[model samples]
Target chain A: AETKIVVGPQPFSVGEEYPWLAERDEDGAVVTFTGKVRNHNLGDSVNALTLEHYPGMTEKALAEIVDEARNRWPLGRVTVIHRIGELWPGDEIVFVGVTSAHRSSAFEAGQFIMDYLKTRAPFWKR
Target chain B: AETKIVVGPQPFSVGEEYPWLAERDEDGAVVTFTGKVRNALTLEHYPGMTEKALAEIVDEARNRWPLGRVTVIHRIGELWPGDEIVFVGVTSAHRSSAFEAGQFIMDYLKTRAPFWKR
Candidate 1:
């Protein structure tokens, strides 16, 4: 199992970790999820958003999330990247790509990692 | 809101149609699924008729979910092991809806396989 976790202010694209998804012959299914900053929150409208993270814990929590997902599925390669700082509507905030021999496992694990990451990563702790 | 259905022998990248979902500035969740060939197999489809059928599938998914953007593509021709086969991508304001829509489109497309008469 290969894992890559990056959290920073730099913006990343689906193509960033795409080689892992595109050039693999061993894995038959590749599932990827991207979280973007929508224009609004709930019903209200928003212009811009700023996100910050507690350096160490944030990374630690994300690593744990991926580890737990690997435990549940026999995945091939994994990539997780989070962009902190100010982001406008449509800016990508996070990206998760997982590969496995089966689509179900890849899909399930991809969604699970996201659920746990959102459930509480304590990303913002002053 | 946006729909793309391509059936051809040439393979496409996730980046090709990615701008639509990425620049929506409205969608929050984007889900993409790719399936490839593991064994030697060749599939044939009924050219225009095949693409039309997939369009209907995408339309049905749109009716079920508030999808922001979608991209569905399948390869038709002789295929060998490791050859890329199909791709499905969906974008929405939330995670669950996007995932559901993506899965639904893939399931329906695979089941129907509208053009595989050969």
Candidate 2:
């Protein structure tokens, strides 16, 4: 029942963040999804990737998203980190990590959290 | 198109792995799932046959979803509490595909692949 939500411009690494989520012994199942900037957008080949986000509003929605996930599933530690500003291809833009006693809930909650984040947001990819 | 399936006793680290799965510029999502032996008594594997089953499971996942890289690693011989039992990872152009594929790979490997746990 622990949650950490962040919306910032700093970069995040899955290697660094994922280990923390799996450290708890009770959390036998660890599931993580990371969204990265792709080289191509739609059908066009692209190079640079950037994101724009609202200051406080976006961060608040992120927490709300976490709350919904918690209500829907039995999760242990959940972490969501979203970045804004300039980004490059293959660079991580959003990360959602979840842990549970089982894999089904963990995977479903992560999917739910990320799906919500994409639709309800002040964040834009440009 | 990249696939790695390991069925052995060597330990695996996500820190060493997460980097590879996310490196492809064309792939926009990297999904990974890991199972820890929190309270497992003991586990056994079926040698070369188990490895083949693992590879076939990965192939099925790829056929179902568009993916960039896939990794499935499972420990063999014997396993106890506190040891990591399995890891499944997938990379795709879309988050949905990556997530689904990772889940699919994990789901089948447990039931389809040859593994015995006490």
Candidate 3:
């Protein structure tokens, strides 16, 4: 079974992503997550944020997360986009979408990917 | 607050739709649902299946679902080759990502839309 999985952050757009998940009939549920650089966190005027990932290590960790989600649910398609380098306030930072035959799997997969990305993926943010 | 939402099923292209969802900064989660005419079911050879809906039944059903972000699109009019039909997507967070939200909306929307296919 071929799972429709995609990942990237080149000229990102959100509107197109939603319909992409709807294109397939196998996908019963699609889940997405978006992260942005927030302002006024304790009255902090944050101009920009920089992120660094451990190259190969980051990919490995993400793969593990995807696999874990797979074990837990029957998914149709999965995608993860993590922004690196400098990001300004209100800039789209990350995107995660999971497609599954049932809503439960899709939901769990989306959550699982984020949790793993947060704890396991080797990334330093400043 | 206004929600980032869109609808319709004209000249549908999946590639173009996914990126659109990523463009929103406020979107913390997204969920989608796609319905198509299945060929094989219960070992039966059905050429194609048709769906029927009441005038506002689809919308009402869709609104009933829980969600973080919601989008629903259904194919209408005569469909032909390379024609795309039906689309539903939602966004949310907390790992749960409003899975139920999207599903709930979809369930309700299905009952709201008015159309019959054969």
List each candidate's DockQ score. 0.76, 0.78, 0.23
Score each candidate by Cα lDDT: 0.83, 0.84, 0.55
Q: What tens-digit string does per-residue lDDT give for candidate 2 at A35-87?
A: 87766643476556668888889989998988888888999999999988888
For candidate 1, write residues A17-126 as lDDT tens digits: 77765567888888899998766542366555778998889989999999999888998888889999878777888999998998889889999999999886777621
Expressed as tens digits, the lDDT of each residue in B1-118 for candidate 3 is 1233333334555456645543444454455555544321211111222233322333443465433334455556555432345565554433243455555655665554344454
Better candidate by lDDT, 2 or 3: 2
Question: lDDT by residue for model 2 over B62-102, one digit each (tens)?
Answer: 78888898888998766666577799989989888888888
- The total of clashing pairs for model 1 equals 0
Model 1 interface DockQ: 0.76
What digit string (tens of lDDT, one per residue) describes model 1 on residues B1-118?
A: 8788889888777776677655676778999999888644668888788788888888888888888878889988778777778889898888898988888887787787664624
For every model shown, what is its TM-score relative to the native structure?
Answer: 0.92, 0.92, 0.64
For model 2, name the residue pairs that clash.
none
Q: For every model in order, what is the iRMS?
A: 1.2, 1.2, 4.9
Native contact fraction, candidates in order: 0.78, 0.84, 0.31
Top candidate when judged by lDDT against the true structure: 2
lDDT of 2: 0.84
| Poorest stretch of ten by lDDT in candidate 3 chain A | A1-10
